[PDB]
Amino acid sequence: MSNIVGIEYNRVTNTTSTDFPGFSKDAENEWNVEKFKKDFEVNISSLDAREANFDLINIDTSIANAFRRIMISEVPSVAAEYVYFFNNTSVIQDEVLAHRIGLVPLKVDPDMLTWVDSNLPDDEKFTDENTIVLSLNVKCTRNPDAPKGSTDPKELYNNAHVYARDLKFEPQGRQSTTFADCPVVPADPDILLAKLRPGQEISLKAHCILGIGGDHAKFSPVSTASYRLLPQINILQPIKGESARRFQKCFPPGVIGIDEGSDEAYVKDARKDTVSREVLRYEEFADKVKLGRVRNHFIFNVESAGAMTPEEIFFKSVRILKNKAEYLKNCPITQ
Amino acid sequence: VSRDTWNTKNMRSLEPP
Amino acid sequence: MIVPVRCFSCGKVVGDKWESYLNLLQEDELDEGTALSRLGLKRYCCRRMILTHVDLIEKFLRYNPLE
Amino acid sequence: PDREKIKLLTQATSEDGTSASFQIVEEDHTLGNALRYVIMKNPDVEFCGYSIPHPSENLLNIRIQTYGETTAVDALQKGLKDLMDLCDVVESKFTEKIKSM
Amino acid sequence: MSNTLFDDIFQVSEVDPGRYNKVCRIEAASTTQDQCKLTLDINVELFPVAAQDSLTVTIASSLNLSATRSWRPPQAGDRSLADDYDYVMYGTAYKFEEVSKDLIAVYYSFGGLLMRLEGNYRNLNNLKQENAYLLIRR
Amino acid sequence: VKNNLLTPKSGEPIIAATQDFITGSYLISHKDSFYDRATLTQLLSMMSDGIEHFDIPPPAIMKPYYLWTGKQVFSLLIKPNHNSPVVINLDAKNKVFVPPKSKSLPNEMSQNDGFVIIRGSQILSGVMDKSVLGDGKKHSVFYTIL
Ligand SMILES: [Zn+2]
Numbered sequence: 001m002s003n004i005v006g007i008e009y010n011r012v013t014n015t016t017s018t019d020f021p022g023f024s025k026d027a028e029n030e031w032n033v034e035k036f037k038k039d040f041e042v043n044i045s046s047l048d049a050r051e052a053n054f055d056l057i058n059i060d061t062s063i064a065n066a067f068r069r070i071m072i073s074e075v076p077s078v079a080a081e082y083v084y085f086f087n088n089t090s091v092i093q094d095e096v097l098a099h100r101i102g103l104v105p106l107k108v109d110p111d112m113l114t115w116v117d118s119n120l121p122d123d124e125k126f127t128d129e130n131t132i133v134l135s136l137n138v139k140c141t142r143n144p145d146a147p148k149g150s151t152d153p154k155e156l157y158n159n160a161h162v163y164a165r166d167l168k169f170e171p172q173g174r175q176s177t178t179f180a181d182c183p184v185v186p187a188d189p190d191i192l193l194a195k196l197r198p199g200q201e202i203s204l205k206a207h208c209i210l211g212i213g214g215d216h217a218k219f220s221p222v223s224t225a226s227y228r229l230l231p232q233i234n235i236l237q238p239i240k241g242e243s244a245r246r247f248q249k250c251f252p253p254g255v256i257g258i259d260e261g262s263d264e265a266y267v268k269d270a271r272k273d274t275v276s277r278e279v280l281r282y283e284e285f286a287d288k289v290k291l292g293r294v295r296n297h298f299i300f301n302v303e304s305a306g307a308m309t310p311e312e313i314f315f316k317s318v319r320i321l322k323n324k325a326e327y328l329k330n331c332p333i334t335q
Numbered sequence: 336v337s338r339d340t341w342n343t344k345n346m347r348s349l350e351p352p
Numbered sequence: 353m354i355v356p357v358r359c360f361s362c363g364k365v366v367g368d369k370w371e372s373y374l375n376l377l378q379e380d381e382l383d384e385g386t387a388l389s390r391l392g393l394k395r396y397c398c399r400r401m402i403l404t405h406v407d408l409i410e411k412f413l414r415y416n417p418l419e
Numbered sequence: 420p421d422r423e424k425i426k427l428l429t430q431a432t433s434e435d436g437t438s439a440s441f442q443i444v445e446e447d448h449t450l451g452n453a454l455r456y457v458i459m460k461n462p463d464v465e466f467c468g469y470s471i472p473h474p475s476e477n478l479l480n481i482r483i484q485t486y487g488e489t490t491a492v493d494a495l496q497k498g499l500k501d502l503m504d505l506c507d508v509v510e511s512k513f514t515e516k517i518k519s520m
Numbered sequence: 521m522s523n524t525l526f527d528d529i530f531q532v533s534e535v536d537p538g539r540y541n542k543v544c545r546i547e548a549a550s551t552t553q554d555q556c557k558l559t560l561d562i563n564v565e566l567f568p569v570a571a572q573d574s575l576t577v578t579i580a581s582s583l584n585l586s587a588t589r590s591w592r593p594p595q596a597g598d599r600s601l602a603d604d605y606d607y608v609m610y611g612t613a614y615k616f617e618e619v620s621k622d623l624i625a626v627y628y629s630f631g632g633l634l635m636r637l638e639g640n641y642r643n644l645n646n647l648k649q650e651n652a653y654l655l656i657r658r
Numbered sequence: 659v660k661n662n663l664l665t666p667k668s669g670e671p672i673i674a675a676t677q678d679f680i681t682g683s684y685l686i687s688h689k690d691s692f693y694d695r696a697t698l699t700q701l702l703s704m705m706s707d708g709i710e711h712f713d714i715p716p717p718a719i720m721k722p723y724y725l726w727t728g729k730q731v732f733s734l735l736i737k738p739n740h741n742s743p744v745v746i747n748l749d750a751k752n753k754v755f756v757p758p759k760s761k762s763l764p765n766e767m768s769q770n771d772g773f774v775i776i777r778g779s780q781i782l783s784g785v786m787d788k789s790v791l792g793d794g795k796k797h798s799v800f801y802t803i804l
Contacts, residue, residue, distance in 0.1 A: 428709055431708075431709040431711070438711055440708050440709045452768050455696075456696075465695075465699075465761075466712060466714060467696070467699055467700075468699045468700040468704070468706040469708055470704055470706065471704060473732075480708030480709055484711065
């Protein structure tokens with residue numbers, strides 16, 4: 001108890017915050033910054049162009065899950081919305097191909113585009129500030145060559161595979177200068193869109209706009225953003241001998257180790273632990289260990305689809321939460 | 336990495352349409 | 353038919369992994385599990401998207417009507 | 420001047436405030452849960468909870484009952500101010516750790 | 521002082537969790553009241569109880585020494601009973617039964633955690649009233 | 659529908675809690691369920707739409723923490739505030755009732771929560787089972803309210 005989620009053999013306990021006045025007679029844990037400000041802490045573990053891993057420490061589950069939900073569903077990104085097919089003679093149906101192109105994640109940074117207003121006419125909805133236009137023109141022809149009979153299609157034909165990288169950025173209007181230094185390319189250019197045999201062709205253009213992951217999955221900027229509580233393993237009594245090695249085997253490789261000399265098993269790295277509670281099934285360690293998770297220590301893993309960096313996605317999520325709270329604050333309350 | 340991309344760029348997508 | 357672009361569950365892009373997974377299986381032959389882990393498919397949903405995919409487009413293309 | 424975002428449900432409202440239900444459109448568990456947490460962190464608030472009455476509608480009904488010290492509207496406004504402050508602290512700490520790295 | 525409807529020391533005979541993980545039903549007999557039995561449901565993850573420990577049990581109304589209608593906790597600086605009791609429950613007495621000549625049993629429900637107090641002469645004090653604080657200290 | 663909550667063949671209720679509703683009610687009223695004020699009020703807001711006033715009763719446990727049992731949650735479900743006219747009194751044997759340890763003890767002393775006592779819309783013992791929230795029994799909570 002007391003900030004620790006209890007991991008039992010048949011249940012999970014103590015999962016609610018209990019950090020408010022009215023939990024106990026001491027009406028403590030009133031909200032105040034300069035207490036939360038001094039207790040809250042961030043520990044960044046790693047940073048890539050596509051993945052981040054950081055620890056929001058001493059924050060409540062509601063706020064951490066608010067950030068996670070905003071990242072997954074409410075942070076805007078850019079994806080193809082409308083596909084215009086000039087010619088499609090492949091076996092892949094037009095709508096199937098259009099859906100796939102929509103699922104291709106574009107390496108265009110949002111805040112370069114404005115939100116599309118859907119109240120405008122169709123002739124007046126898409127502008128050089130609202131839309132990215134990607135074309136795709138592939139015609140498959142037999143390779144004018146003669147390799148081994150019935151070989152792999154990469155050399156029997158030409159353009160036998162249509163990749164996402166074949167999607168070409170077409171500047172419209174003033175995008176020729178706005179996007180000159182950051183041309184729009186797929187985040188994953190080896191995405192296989194379609195396979196076509198000689199005589200088949202795919203000609204199209206696609207309009208890409210800002211969207212919300214709640215509106216459609218294709219707009220989500222994170223290939224997964226989630227967290228997990230920090231595992232906590234408390235070895236109540238010394239474990240020694242071969243029993244210590246069995247205890248060690250109950251966890252993933254690096255989680256616990258055997259001290260040299262003392263031959264006692266100690267918790268070496270609880271972060272690497274997945275809570276399979278394997279140890280909680282042996283009745284040998286039944287009272288020699290307590291499994292738990294720190295309820296307010298969140299290990300965020302944010303892996304981005306590719307349009308923006310994971311730390312940017314997280315900051316945008318915090319800014320989105322703050323903005324919606326502030327919008328509500330400014331709004332008047334109507335009877 | 337280690338860049339405050341959000342401070343450098345003036346966001347536009349994040350505001351409500 | 354053709355490999356999905358995204359894992360149905362997490363949304364991770366798996367459509368750029370199909371050819372490289374096929375190459376890892378055929379050339380420098382590895383187990384399916386090790387080939388999947390070498391591509392970064394750690395979550396079992398992402399592993400499923402590649403392990404269970406049936407590449408029916410290659411069969412459907414044998415019936416090309418515009419030969 | 421948005422006049423549709425947050426409404427006060429009068430049938431659910433008491434006399435002299437201190438107990439009121441607010442309807443917030445285009446909101447869901449994201450804002451509802453954080454707001455409820457922050458509002459419960461207020462000593463005068465005796466009751467706070469939200470509900471999305473139906474998934475089909477993008478609507479959130481948040482209920483606040485207080486003791487006599489303040490009205491539900493004041494507790495709501497304080498909750499929104501405190502949520503903004505909390506997110507500001509989170510922003511500062513995260514941007515500082517990004518810069519340090 | 522003048523709010524304790526009942527108080528006595530009990531010696532726990534047995535504690536058993538019957539298919540529960542945080543509530544145990546303890547049985548105790550009074551030390552120096554040869555007739556006073558006690559069957560009591562205790563949240564033991566809050567107040568651990570072991571077999572053969574002596575518990576001071578007190579029944580009181582008004583732990584004290586707007587028309588809001590929602591219960592409000594007493595302030596943190598409020599002097600009250602329970603400032604020297606480890607465990608305190610609030611519930612109602614819903615039944616008095618006769619078990620023999622000059623021997624009665626009283627039933628309290630603390631939100632579903634039952635107490636059965638067997639005794640002889642506790643009539644001018646133990647009423648069928650919502651006001652029932654159970655106070656327990658080690 | 660409200661005029662036909664009972665079947666005419668026996669008078670027993672036929673519109674009542676189904677499977678997951680019964681299990682959720684059981685898990686709430688299970689004797690191991692305790693709730694602090696925040697969780698309790700969120701439960702009550704879920705129970706209503708957030709448009710119902712609730713008179714929060716005193717917590718069952720006042721020390722070391724302010725905790726409400728799940729039976730108090732269901733008592734508030736039956737009768738949320740003092741303006742609610744529903745004052746229910748009910749005795750019921752749950753579908754799995756093991757008797758008390760002694761043949762002379764009252765039924766609410768069942769070794770499990772096998773017996774539901776409701777007095778003044780307050781659930782004083784017993785879990786919320788099929789026998790007290792489902793069909794076919796005239797000691798149902800909803801039948802008595804009806
Ligand atoms: Zn996946």
